[PDB]
Write a structure and sequence with these properties.
The complex is a heterooctamer, with four copies of chain A and four copies of chain B.
Chain A lengths: L1 H4 L1 E5 L4 E6 L4 E7 L8 E8 L10 E10 L4 E13 L5 E10 L10 E9 L2
Antiparallel strand pairs in A: 1-2, 1-8, 2-3, 3-4, 4-5, 5-6, 6-7, 7-8
Chain B lengths: L8
Classes of the chains: A mainly beta, B little secondary structure.
Protein name (chains A, C, E, F): Streptavidin
GO cellular component, one term (chains A, C, E, F): extracellular region
GO molecular function (chains A, C, E, F): biotin binding
């Protein structure tokens, strides 16, 4: 549900993700690194299915972070695509793509790929 | 140390 | 920079993307599918680097569409991650991930991967 | 026919 | 090491993978599904780094299975790319791409993506 | 079918691929890198569907190169997964994954993803 | 039931 | 300069 998704989630690396889910499908919030730290904080925006299917199917969702804030600029951006599964131990299972801004000659190896699982613990 | 990775 | 990303774009399958780049790094607009049609329009939201490394590097960016509107719901969401490259013929080159909501037993096959190039019109 | 594909 | 890789490995779905690693870099063996079963068995072939780096860096490796045998033909093929990490609890961490043979109109969604961890237990 | 896949092919970056398709589904040959050169040749091994679904569907296939030979060792391996499409201008369309051996702390960024199209010569 | 997936 | 890339 939207308020199921709404909260503070942690991944297996220590990163914290804080999200608000709106009734019509909007996703907004903050991402921060270095298992805390002061301005290791970046802005995120996304979308999710606000009307999921009614057997035990997960809720599809996705979001983007560009890696620039008032203190740093890493000239890159990441997108995460996955689904939410509720219950007693709610989870968000994802895969992600990280693209860096490059020169033409370095375009062939601009993008990394990976996977993250987020929980509330 | 890219901000998506661990403490570095 | 914001100005150059703002406009109407099209990919090789004949889809339409309409976008505005804001001064704080924000992206907003509309994605249109099956060769236009009246409303097979969906909302998109994303982020880009607003102070790019400049000499001849691309600008990193990304966005999400959740495939639900007032007429249809496909219970899935796609994320595109890539770079903007200016010039006389401006281009966006991307890689994308599409995830569908599934039951536990079918989660191993929930995600498709691919690539699109967009031309500004 | 998914809306990201061609007329399918 | 080659004989570190040599053995029987199991993934999180119950699939069994049996491999022989040769001294010069060759990888050969059998893959089978349905947590056992009779001819759920398919042939695999691959390559690995036979001379890894000397700090605690993993050994890079990859392999292919085409899904046809004497009893079935699913007209598809999967490749796995990852690295081996030894010690007391040795593991193989991978990501995979599955491509199906399609008609031109279905080429846009021919490929799925995922990740698998294999252990000896 | 085997005959049509056998031959010399080239991609958009100027790399060479030389391959033989055997009757049991096997693939063997050589990959050449930086615009030919004498030995920047590496061994490849793969698998294809030898009894394709035929009307106008592609043939599914895949292969691996580990980047070590008698002159260099890059401590990495790439896998390509895609389809063969016959005609007057035959093509192989692929997506690929490249993994490098890393230490634990850097495993989150070990894999690059991309795409290549090959033309028969 | 594709042979890479679970019992089906 | 990785051998999968162009002369780099």
């Amino acid at each position: 549900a939207e308020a199921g998704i709404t909260g503070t989630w942690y991944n297996q690396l220590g990163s914290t993700f804080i999200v608000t889910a709106g009734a019509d499908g909007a996703l907004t919030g903050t991402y921060e690194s270095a298992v805390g730290n002061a301005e290791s904080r970046y802005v995120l925006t996304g979308r999710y299915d606000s009307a999921p299917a009614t057997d035990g199917s997960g809720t599809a969702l996705g979001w983007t972070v560009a890696w620039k804030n008032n203190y740093r600029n890493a000239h890159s951006a990441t997108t995460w695509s996955g689904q939410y599964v509720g219950g007693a131990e709610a989870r968000i299972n994802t895969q992600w793509l990280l693209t860096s801004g490059t020169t033409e000659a370095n375009a062939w190896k601009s993008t990394l790929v990976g996977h993250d699982t987020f929980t509330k613990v | 140390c890219h901000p998506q990775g661990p403490p570095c």
